[PDB]
Amino acid sequence: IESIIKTATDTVKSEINAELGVVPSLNAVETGATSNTEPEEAIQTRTVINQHGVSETLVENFLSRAALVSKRSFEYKDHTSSTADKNFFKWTINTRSFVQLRRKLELFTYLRFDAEITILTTVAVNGYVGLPDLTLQAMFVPTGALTPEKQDSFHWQSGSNASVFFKISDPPARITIPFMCINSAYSVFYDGFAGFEKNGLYGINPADTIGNLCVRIVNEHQPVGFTVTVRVYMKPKHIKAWAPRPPRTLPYMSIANANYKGKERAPNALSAIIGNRDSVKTMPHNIVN
Amino acid sequence: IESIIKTATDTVKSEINAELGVVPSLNAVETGATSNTEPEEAIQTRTVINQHGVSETLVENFLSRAALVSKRSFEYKDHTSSTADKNFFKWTINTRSFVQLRRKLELFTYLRFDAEITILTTVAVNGYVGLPDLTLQAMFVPTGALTPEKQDSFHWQSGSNASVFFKISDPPARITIPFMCINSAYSVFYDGFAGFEKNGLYGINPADTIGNLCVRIVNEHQPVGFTVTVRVYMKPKHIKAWAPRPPRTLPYMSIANANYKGKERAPNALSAIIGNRDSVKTMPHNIVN
Amino acid sequence: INFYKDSYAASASKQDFSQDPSKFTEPVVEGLKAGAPVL
Amino acid sequence: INFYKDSYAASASKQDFSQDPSKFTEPVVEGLKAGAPVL
Amino acid sequence: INFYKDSYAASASKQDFSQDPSKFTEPVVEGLKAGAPVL
Amino acid sequence: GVPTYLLPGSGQFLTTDDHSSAPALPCFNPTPEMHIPGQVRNMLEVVQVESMMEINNTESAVGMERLKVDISALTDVDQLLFNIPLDIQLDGPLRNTLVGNISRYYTHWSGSLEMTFMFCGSFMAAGKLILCYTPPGGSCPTTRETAMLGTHIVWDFGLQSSVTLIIPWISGSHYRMFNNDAKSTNANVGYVTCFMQTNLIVPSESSDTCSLIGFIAAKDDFSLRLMRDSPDIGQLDHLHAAEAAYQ
Amino acid sequence: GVPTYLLPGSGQFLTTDDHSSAPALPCFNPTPEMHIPGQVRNMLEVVQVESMMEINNTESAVGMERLKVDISALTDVDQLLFNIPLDIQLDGPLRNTLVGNISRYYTHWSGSLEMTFMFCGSFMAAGKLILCYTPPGGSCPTTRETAMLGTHIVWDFGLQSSVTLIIPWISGSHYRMFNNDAKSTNANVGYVTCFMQTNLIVPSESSDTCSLIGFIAAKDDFSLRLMRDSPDIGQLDHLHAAEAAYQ
Amino acid sequence: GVPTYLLPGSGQFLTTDDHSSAPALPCFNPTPEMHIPGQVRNMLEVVQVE
Amino acid sequence: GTHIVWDFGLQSSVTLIIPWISGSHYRMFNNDAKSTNANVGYVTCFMQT
Amino acid sequence: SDRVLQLKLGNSAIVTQEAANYCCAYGEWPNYLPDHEAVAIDKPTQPETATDRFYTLKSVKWETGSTGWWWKLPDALNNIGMFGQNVQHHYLYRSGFLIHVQCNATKFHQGALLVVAIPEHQRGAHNTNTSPGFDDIMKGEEGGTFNHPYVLDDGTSLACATIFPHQWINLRTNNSATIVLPWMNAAPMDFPLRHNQWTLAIIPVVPLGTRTTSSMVPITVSIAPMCCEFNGLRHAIT
Ligand SMILES: CC(C)Oc1ccc(CNc2cccc3c(-c4ccc(C#N)nc4)ccnc23)cc1
């Protein structure tokens, strides 16, 4: 039954049991149900009024904290002779690059949420003059819009694209992107192929495509070079989640897929996820006095 | 009797006394009670309407002011050849390092409060170029979480750890940590051993473990070196306090224990806490005219 | 505090305390009993 | 002023004027008297 | 505007228009008269 | 104008803050909601589902073999068959479980655990086992006469394939910590042991060796506190094709 | 937008400020409260408890010997036995007391003090003492005929082991200061002296020398003001193992 | 958050301004008032004395 | 066992009650003193101070 | 009337004719753990009169050089009678204590004992950085002696120890002290082998003196656990 649960369940006192035909510790795992054996059935209990709150395990609280999704460093310099991110970069938006957020999200099959984005920028002098207070432009370039080819291309005039202009001395730039799947939920996993032909990508729902984040320095280059690093954080909010999954055990290999190899030896080897003990009779950290 | 006290008690006028069997200046210290002799019983008094407030000696006011709990200096430089805090540090959280807060807290056996934390950062040029406006990250790493090994290790991606990102030009960074003991109160003193074996630590309740504070500079190193100093202040708030104690007399020796040596000579020598006078008949600052 | 015109701009919704774990723990067509054996 | 969702975020509570010093000054099972000798 | 808990934190009190200059100009035990000579 | 002053913490990026923020796409209309099976709203719903313990975490158990314990007929009475370390923070049989993997995002835990064992011998196999929980304080028991002094279930094999041992929450404090110090009095739970109560008795044409699968779940009195990054995942390099997202 | 301006004091860290601040652990649930014996809510409850004066703060009094005063039979009438300096700010018998140690976190004080003396001779010991408080203005009295002009209690030894001398709050100002200038008219309290009223008289098989223990407490008219760092504790180096908290 | 902007005069120290400011000594209790002879409340009372 | 700690004072005397602690309703005056139907146990006195 | 007292608990009784009232620490009385404060859900054993009775420790000799004595609770009782057997078989314990301290001498003797119950008396070592070891702390029924009673072996002071629950034995006035201790812990129950809630301390602030013929003057300690509960039944650690 669906019910409102704010605290852990109370324990009732229980007596001795000796009833024929009543056998609450016996179960049948083959049904696929979990054991319904209560502690009051397994042992004699006392009454316990339980006050422990359950708010910290809410899916909202579990997922709605800001995580790094993108980090890029580029040279802020005169690029006339470079081969390179020439005072700007383009990022194809994804959540698979940083394993801590990736593993948390992949505990679920379908997710619906809005994304709070924070952009943190940092600058160092290339191998000192002090640090300049640069202006940056982040521009969202949706599917089928033209991405900028140059720091000063006219794409940056941004007539209809969302842009945010922000300083390095400011607090980190912050915006919310709405839930923008063409379905009612994002497909965290996708057992399918993106195209009507056979050559399309496995494992990525086309319905979930966000677009590109294009970031430039707005200033003309200075006489000396700098490295600029941009960090993007995403925080899910107003979250719905469906069909929880076995967590990732093996190290990730790629952002394109669930391909797996494991560590050379346990823990998280393909052959052994838990580290070995000497025998099933060995207690590894046994208390001895 | 428990009662609400906002001001010091009033004095009533008293007359001459000459009653047989009534002897209010006599007492019995052996019961363990303090003397109940009132001034109206010991001398002839006038009436005094007393307005003096008692708010400044509230335990809330006595303890809830910000005190330094941690101070660390490290080099912000290229550390490829250093032996060292290489652009970041880890602190195992404790309150025993700075004696002024330590002595105040140790007036009590059990304390329950929330902690307001302020982080103040300062920078100097190593032996001038001006001072850079660095971004720092403080990350709380609870018990059994992995601490960062490097300034740019992926631990800093902070998917579930609380992190605060803050600038040197900003006001000091401020957060509240909730009261987080697994008991109803912190054990300011602990007459016990932390483990089920005999080799565990004396004097530290395992229930009170907070975790680690990991602090890095987020910027890449500059061409020149800097010293960064981080100061952490803690302010108790929403305070409850139980079983007040004899104050510390001897200088502290260690953060691990109550070990004591004293000063070489009084005051606060092991043999003499108060400085000596010549005799019990000597008045040290006697008024003479 | 939300002065933005779009409701998706709002702060997070941390008040949804409804649970139904039986859809994951007991998706059996005939519900289990305490006082009777499962099979 | 507190716009935070957790009540532990609040400013300090400086209004608790309840005292009972007799638990420290007079933990004797038979209370002392003014008009009679202690022993 | 005062969100501080201590009332001494407040802005200044510029509304006290009570005067009694006679304590400085006329501290004589018998008050002066207009229609009669002083001595 | 309004007179103001800035407090400490002004302009910081706290990753757990909760504010409204500026919508980048004005007048956007999200896709209507649709009912989907299996909505989860509290992670305590997940840990209440039972999942297999890797009890046979031994060398020469390979892959799936680590999820079953083989039982054989014995010629000595009351022998120990296996034990299970209960330290969820350290790398033992409980770690790669639903209750295990979710709890490791948290630092504090409280409440009861359920272990269920399914007997997977033939219909003709018979036997009785005793499953014992030992509250902490001393060594793990090695003899049945010692183990039966703790909380235990005697299990008769029959038509019902499974028993539960409830591990009741017996703790001095409200919570335990997921402490890498497993011997800490704030973290140690004690032990589970299995002994022969009678014997595994099988006829000639049944297989002489039979397997147990063990499961664990949290009960609905279970509670978790103080979120942390889970130590179960990490990275050293960038992943493959991550750089290509910038090209 | 709201028009605003920033005042002086914007962005300062005042260590005595009182604001709400951002919670780092959202949805955290603290451990339920439990009743514990001995809750203290005002530090004036502590200073009302009596504690031993170190009256014998002399060389060749070692350790516990500094907490007792030895009384002997005299062959001259009305002799002075001891005096007690009352300057709580300076290092005298009152400093390492409950009232002493708490008051030294504060700068101003007001209200009455209680001194209690317990006689610890044998049951067969007898005697009368006079305990005198002298309000300030002149020298400490050296003769009983001078001291008995102040506030005094004549004490007969008997079944009740103890007398209190109340030191009444006799002050021109509402408060006194804990002033390192002990002769300042804002700080000096005057003196306590003890004389023989009769004599210590003991039989041959009682010990010829007997001890007083002196105690002090604040009364409930006592008040403290203006919090300061206490001069009773300091450090020069880091403590041992403090550096190791960073390793 | 509240949208705001700063006006001219933000962050200035005008010596005749009149704001509340942060109390450095929380829960401090001032000495009770006492009646004193000769309270002056307006300086025009002084200039009326010859 | 059952004991009374006795302080000497103005009241000259203490009582130790020996309570009837017996499996049966009665005991026998048995010349076999070690018989389980007859043995009552022991009284002992020690210095407390 | 406040000088005569009888304490009766289980099969044990103490009479004194020369008490000085008695102390109830913080004005509390021992109680069993209520349901709104319970943590452990197994039904507790409550042995009552088998545990809730006076145990008398070995007496110590008060000598002119004595620095004082201490005993830790529950440690001093962890091996005594049915109390010890229940602590050995159970993970968790809770109780109060009633402490009665006994010391008679003649009317020609003098001397004063501070009798004080110290909560969480975490000891220091003298003149070292190394923390006190297990065998320094855990003494059992014998208890320990003070190294430096003037700082209470913890760098604080004897003069202020009257903030803790205490009585005096002043040989002029009284020959016994009584202290009733509630449960005093941050957790509702504890593991009795690794944490001591209370330290009993007996300190001779005024030394024993007489000019009659000397006799041995013992100090005797009787402690009754009050409202014993035990949880987490298993084999004996022992
Ligand atoms: C320049 C400004 C004005 O616009 C911007 C700024 C930044 C961004 C970067 N956003 C984003 C970065 C990373 C992920 C997302 C997602 C997302 C997350 C998880 C899942 C799953 N499972 N699915 C989708 C949705 C919307 N956004 C995202 C986009 C537009």
Ligand SMILES: CC(C)Oc1ccc(CNc2cccc3c(-c4ccc(C#N)nc4)ccnc23)cc1
């Ligand atoms: C990086 C940010 C987001 O998180 C942070 C930031 C800073 C910190 C440092 N906190 C802390 C530093 C020092 C002490 C504490 C205590 C504490 C105090 C006194 C007693 C006693 N008696 N017992 C516990 C509780 C919580 N905290 C503390 C922790 C997490």
